[PDB]
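CUGBP Elav-like family member 2
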Amino acid sequence: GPEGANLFIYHLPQEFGDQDILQMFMPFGNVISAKVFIDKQTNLSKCFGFVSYDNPVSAQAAIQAMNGFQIGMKRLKVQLK
């Protein structure tokens, strides 16, 4: 995740996994890695995670479009690392 190409995404539906956030974020550029952080004992998602582009412009673009975007019952908080 070269800087400033890295996002933290909070308020993510519990059901989302790595691939879901990756795909949700590809509209803004090539996502090169994505991880949803999971409680290791339950395997339930902790509802945030990490998106990493291959350039920072994509990351800004994504932040402006997605921060505050409502999906399900939650609104995503998306910020730069």
